[PDB]
RNA sequence: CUUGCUUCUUUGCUGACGAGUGGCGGACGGGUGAGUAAUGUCUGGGAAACUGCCUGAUGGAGGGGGAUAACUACUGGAAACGGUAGCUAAUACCGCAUAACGUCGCAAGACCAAAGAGGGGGACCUUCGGGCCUCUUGCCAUCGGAUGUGCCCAGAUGGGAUUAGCUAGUAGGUGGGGUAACGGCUCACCUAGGCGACGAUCCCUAGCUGGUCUGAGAGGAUGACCAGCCACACUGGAACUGAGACACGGUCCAGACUCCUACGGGAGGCAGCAGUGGGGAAUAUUGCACAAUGGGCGCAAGCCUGAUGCAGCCAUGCCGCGUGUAUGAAGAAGGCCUUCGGGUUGUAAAGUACUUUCAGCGGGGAGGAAGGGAGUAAAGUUAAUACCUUUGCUCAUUGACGUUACCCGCAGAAGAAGCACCGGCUAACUCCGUGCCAGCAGCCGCGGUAAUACGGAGGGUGCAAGCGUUAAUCGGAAUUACUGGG
């Protein structure tokens, strides 16, 4: 619709790339830790859980994640992680 | 020296009037042309032009038409007419200047159709002042007879043009020639038609007359243009004309005085309710008289015949045919408004002169066939859409107390107007036509109290309503007349 | 955000005020949490003009009310000390 | 909204004196009473139950002047009070203004007495009222305003006063025209004649 | 050229301000009940939660970097609308330092953030960009309170058995993922469970409720206007921004319908306020203003508000007032009836004496108005009698309604009464005209040449700016009987 009011839609058009481009790398982190799950080498298990904790409290604190998800993130992943070590 | 009359010096009036088959339709679609902007309808073209800003109104060209002209030649100040060769000067021409006498209008005609045969100058200036007994002094006149017109020789301005064919779709110039004497414009159009063109202009300077200013005000010598409407040439040089010629708008008659266009209280009466074509809705129209006070966009006008304040804020501007957005202009316009049956013709407005103009021209019609309502479903689009269309000049519909056989009012001949118009957003049905005889001029008539009661008592059975609550009593025969006249009707009479 | 704010109730011509706790996205005939006190503007001199309970407005302000500017000047015409 | 009619034919009608045509004048006997309400008032009707419920119902409407839709609103108003209906419904009959105006003798009749509370003369508790139908307070004081007061309409009227029984829950001057209004009427009092009851059946049903 | 009178190019240096970046609002206000028989609503509980704007408490607010719009040069398109190559700022973006009762973990341990602006100024210091001192406001993290929202359970919330079997992510469990959060919410494995005659599955209908009407009550229909919730925004699906939408005036895709085109492609969604076509017996103005409230933004002044406050139309419903009152017999004229004596219309009308509600006109004139602006004084704050907050106090004031409500004056009964019925139910009688015809009628029923029923006249009755008819609900109807039948 014709609006003064449409600038919102194309600046979220501007937030949809980059804010979930931060998502995207979230969680491939996340599915690099799930690879030392597939790998078994607890070393690197540590090694990825600890590459990827700063980054997902980050992503918890920029308002994209709600500091819940990210708790359940790290709390089943340590629960895996001191499981197979 | 205020901008504000500066400008009321830049407002121009010139509608069109002509003979049937004359070319108004293609003079006006070509002056669109060079602003960079048969025969049912009416349209006003404001204009985008540079130098003034001079409007146009036009109107159907017919007897049994143009009863709009009679009244909004009294809108425009000055004249245009448009006289064919083949034509000539017909009764047509004979009523159009029976009514510009009445004014003395400012008269500038046109001689169309170039394309075709024409007879000589000097018989069509004789068959002019012989048979509207008015002068005229002519300035230019192409070259020889049929379809050898290429070229224009004017004389106060000094000025050589010629024509190309096949012009009519784009604009392209010609050039340009300055003497008059040359010999290469006698080898470039040809040396005995231009020692014929050059005799006729010693004849024309030997036989006519020189310019007026003061005398061209009341119209007494009017003077001639030349040039075709399709060739995009001959109107060119209207323009010019138009600036030079024209004067302010003029002061119009009310009860009291004269009103220039100098003072205030917006004198925008109603002329005509166009026959109106409905995207989705009517707003009938408002074609104005605003020539005196510059308009304001929140001004609330007051009806005087009505004697109300009404707020009336939106207002369409007539740029290039399109009604286009709100917009207020300069004083010498003409608007269009948006009513819902409250205005009627002629229904005068000021901020407080409570006084009435001297207008109100066109009364009555033959009577033709009526409704009978094919497909009888939803009749309610014709009492309510063609009692729309009965407060105009051309159609007055007749109820009869019956509630059938509802006469549509035709003052012309052709009725295919209203036929057309029945195929409309709110119109639906179709109404063929056939031959019903009812006479004459149900004159309409409306008598003082306690005396036409009698008068509806004794014959209650021969009573018709009409467009506007009005009786007029019933026209079957001129018997029936006599016996009206008979029965001593005395009344405050009003024509409608 | 919670407010406090006048409601106009009434007739036509006739208003009649309530002044409501209410949230700021509700309407102003619309929900309210409780209603607490009135205003007449059209009050004149007679045996009651303007109710107000300053209990649950004090209530209200401990909460985090915004008071808008009416309902200030009538916490002004009820002084503490007048 | 007013009758503004035969006023006297409808005492003819009811056979009893409605007092319509009270005046300065006294008892007419100018119009056959009782023995010819209208054309064909020789005949003696059967008289039913509905009959007389709607007769004396009429007939204390047209001694009070109040319309059917308003006297069921009345009616509708002394249902829910205390007591009991048929008081109740006579004591608001009586609580009308014009009716007071009329007591009190400022007006020979009770038409004169609603134009006189109309034409804003008729004022009650320093408060100017129009409305003929305004319910008395008790413990009031009416009067005439000084621009209306004594224009010989109330003078010659005031002498009809001297002659109606003066009742007791009204007190009036007779010296500068202002009223007391008082305690409400009993049953007892007020003219002794009319059947309340009458009308407490056809309102029942 | 009247040399400080006027003309006039630069100049963001100010008051302010198109467009642009950014923050908030757009998820509220407004419209409709299409869909929906439980994913909805109401009643009552519950935890496995969220919560910007409001507010309380405790701390921080340190140090840096890279792009980009707007702006330039070229260029595509008719427009809508961009692309390439450079420059720059932020409360826009991104790292580094730094953390706690915050997140994870049994603990050890690991990790997580920001932003600064506006006013005034003493000393010092000014590369003279300003630091610095104070106040106000904003930001980040946590614990909370309130508000609103998300989720679960029980009961209640139409008909049909001429709908008796339904279900395969179905029922439960384990494990992984996902949601602010429990959750077959979603995938891998295991078992065959789960619903149902106290109506499962299927069809039709319907927004739900507080409430409305009726009814003594129990009940019955309804739920239109006021208010709460839900659902929807030409149809369907889908995600993003955002705390809150899977979105009326946001995006994309697919479909239907109008319009433009220079034919390459685009614009649109009144179940908003107005208004129009169509439908139908039936429903309004393309009006004024933020004067007041409320909402959004801003410190504030100010801006928007078709919500609202009103104005216009409609007797649609209720209420009130008036259309005169007193007197006035020749018991006039005219109409109707008659046993032609007379009666009725009828104190009705004429006449006389007063008065003018409401309309017409001419003048005063509240209240809905609180606030906000400027100036002054006092108390806080601070180094500060400067800035800022608050309270008295002085001035100019803020009304669409509005030619306001209301009051006074002018004139003249002057401008203002209709509709149904008259055999019974149920209020009221005759005459004339047809003649089981014309016709009336809610039921019984009249009219076949003496009609209290049709039509007309007179008179009366009832209601009153309304009156009759039609349509719907309840009562009477205890003729759906649970109260209260056989
Ligand atoms: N070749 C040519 N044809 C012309 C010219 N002017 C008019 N015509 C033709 O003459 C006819 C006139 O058409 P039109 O413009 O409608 O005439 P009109 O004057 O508007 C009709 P009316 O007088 O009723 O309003 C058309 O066929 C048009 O093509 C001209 O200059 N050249």
Redesign the pocket.
């Given at each position: 619709?014709?609006?003064?009011?449409?600038?919102?839609?194309?600046?979220?058009?501007?937030?949809?790339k980059?804010?979930?481009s931060?998502?995207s790398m979230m969680?491939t982190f996340?599915k690099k830790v799930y690879a030392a799950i597939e790998a078994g080498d607890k070393a690197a298990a540590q090694k990825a859980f600890?590459e990827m904790?700063?980054?997902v409290?980050?992503q918890?604190?920029?308002?994209?994640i709600?500091?819940?998800?990210?708790?359940?993130?790290?709390?089943?992943?340590?629960?895996?992680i001191?499981k197979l070590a | 020296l205020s901008p504000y009359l500066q400008e009321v010096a830049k407002r121009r009036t010139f509608a069109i009037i002509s003979h049937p088959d004359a070319g108004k339709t293609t003079i006006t679609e070509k002056v669109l042309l060079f602003g960079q902007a048969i025969s049912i309808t009416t349209s006003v073209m404001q204009f985008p032009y540079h130098d003034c800003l001079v409007n146009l109104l036009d109107t159907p060209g017919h007897e049994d038409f143009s009863e709009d002209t009679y009244r909004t030649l009294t809108a425009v100040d000055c004249c245009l007419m448009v006289i064919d060769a083949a034509k000539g000067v017909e009764d047509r021409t004979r009523k159009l200047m029976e009514v510009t006498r009445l004014r003395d209008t400012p008269i500038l005609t046109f001689m169309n159709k170039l394309d075709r045969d024409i007879r000589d100058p000097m018989e069509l200036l004789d068959e002019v002042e012989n048979e509207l007994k008015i002068g005229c002094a002519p300035i230019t006149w192409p070259i020889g007879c049929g379809k050898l017109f290429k070229g224009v020789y004017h004389l106060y301005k000094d000025e050589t043009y010629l024509y190309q064919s096949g012009k009519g779709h784009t604009i392209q110039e010609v050039r340009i020639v300055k003497g008059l004497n040359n010999p290469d414009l006698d080898a470039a159009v040809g040396e005995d038609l231009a020692q014929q063109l050059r005799d006729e202009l010693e004849l024309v300077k030997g036989a006519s007359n020189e310019f007026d200013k003061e005398l061209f005000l009341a119209g007494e010598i009017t003077p001639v243009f030349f040039g075709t409407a399709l060739g995009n040439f001959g109107v060119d040089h209207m323009l010019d004309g138009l600036v030079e010629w024209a004067p302010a708008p003029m002061p119009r008659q009310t009860d009291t005085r004269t009103v220039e266009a100098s003072e205030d209280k917006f004198t925008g009466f109603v002329f005509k309710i166009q026959a109106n074509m409905?995207p989705?809705?009517?707003?009938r129209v408002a074609f104005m008289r605003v020539v005196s006070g510059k308009y304001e966009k929140?001004m609330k006008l007051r009806q005087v015949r009505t004697a109300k304040?009404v707020?009336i804020?939106?207002a369409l501007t007539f740029m290039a045919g399109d009604r286009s957005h709100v917009e207020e202009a300069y004083p010498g316009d003409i608007l269009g408004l948006?009513n819902?049956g409250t205005i009627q013709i002629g229904d005068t407005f000021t901020q407080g002169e409570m006084m009435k103009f001297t207008g109100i021209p066109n009364f009555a019609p033959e009577l033709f066939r009526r409704i009978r309502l094919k497909d009888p479903?939803?009749q309610?689009?014709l009492l309510?859409?063609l009692v729309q269309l009965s407060e105009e000049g051309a159609v007055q519909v007749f109820r009869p107390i019956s509630n059938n056989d509802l006469i549509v009012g035709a003052v012309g001949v052709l009725q295919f107007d209203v036929v057309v118009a029945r195929l409309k957003?709110?119109?639906?049905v179709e109404a063929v036509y056939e031959s019903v005889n009812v006479a004459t001029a149900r004159w309409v008539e409306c008598a003082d109290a306690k005396k036409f009661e009698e008068f509806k008592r004794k014959n209650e059975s021969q009573l018709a309503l009409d467009g506007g609550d009005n009786l007029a009593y019933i026209a079957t025969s001129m018997v029936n007349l006599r016996l009206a006249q008979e029965r001593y009707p005395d009344v405050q009479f009003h024509q409608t | 955000?919670?407010?406090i704010?006048?409601?106009?109730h009434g007739?036509?011509?006739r208003?009649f005020?309530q002044v409501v706790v209410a949230?700021?996205?509700?309407?102003?005939?619309?929900?309210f949490?409780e209603r607490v006190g009135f205003f007449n503007?059209?009050a004149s001199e007679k045996e009651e003009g303007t109710r107000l309970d300053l209990d649950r407005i004090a209530h209200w302000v401990?909460?985090?009310?915004?008071i808008?500017?009416?309902?200030?000047?009538?916490i002004?015409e009820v002084n503490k000390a007048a | 909204?007013?009758?503004?009619?035969?006023?006297?034919?409808?005492s003819?009608?009811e056979g009893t004196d409605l007092f319509?045509?009270?005046?300065?004048?006294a008892i007419?006997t100018?119009?056959?009473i009782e023995q010819?309400?209208?054309?064909?008032?020789?005949?003696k009707?059967?008289l039913?139950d509905?009959?007389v419920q709607?007769?004396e119902?009429?007939k204390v409407?047209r001694i009070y002047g109040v319309?059917?839709?308003?006297f069921?609103?009345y009616y509708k108003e002394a249902a829910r009070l205390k007591g009991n209906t048929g008081e109740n419904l006579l004591a608001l009959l009586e609580g009308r203004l014009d009716n007071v105006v009329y007591r009190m003798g400022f007006?020979?009749?009770?038409?004169?007495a609603?134009?006189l509370?109309?034409?804003?003369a008729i004022m009650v508790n320093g408060r100017?009222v129009?409305?003929?139908?305004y319910q008395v307070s008790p413990n009031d004081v009416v009067s005439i305003?000084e621009?209306?007061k004594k224009?010989?309409?109330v003078k010659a009227?005031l002498e009809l006063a001297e002659q109606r029984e003066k009742p007791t829950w009204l007190e009036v001057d007779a010296g500068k025209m202002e009223g007391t209004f008082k305690r409400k009427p009993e049953r007892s009092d007020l003219s002794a004649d009319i059947n309340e009851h009458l009308i407490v059946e056809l309102y029942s049903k």
């Open positions: 619709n014709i609006k003064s009011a449409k600038k919102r839609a194309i600046q979220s058009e501007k937030a949809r980059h804010n979930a931060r998502r969680r996340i600890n904790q700063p980054i409290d980050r918890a604190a920029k308002g994209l709600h500091k819940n998800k990210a708790a359940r993130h790290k709390a089943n992943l340590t629960a895996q001191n | 409905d989705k809705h009517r707003d929140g304040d707020v804020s939106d948006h819902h479903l939803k309610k689009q309510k859409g957003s709110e119109y639906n | 955000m919670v407010t704010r006048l409601a106009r007739a036509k011509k208003p005020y949230d700021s996205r509700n309407a102003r005939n619309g929900r949490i503007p059209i401990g909460q985090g009310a915004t808008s500017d009416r309902v200030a000047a009538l002004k | 909204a007013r009758y503004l009619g035969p006023k006297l034919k409808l003819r009608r319509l045509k009270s005046g300065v004048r007419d100018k119009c056959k010819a309400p209208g054309q064909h008032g020789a005949r009707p059967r039913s509905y009959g709607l007769r119902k009429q409407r319309l059917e839709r308003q069921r609103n007006g020979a009749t009770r038409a004169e609603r134009q509370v109309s034409h804003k100017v129009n409305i003929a139908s305003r621009k209306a224009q010989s309409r009227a």
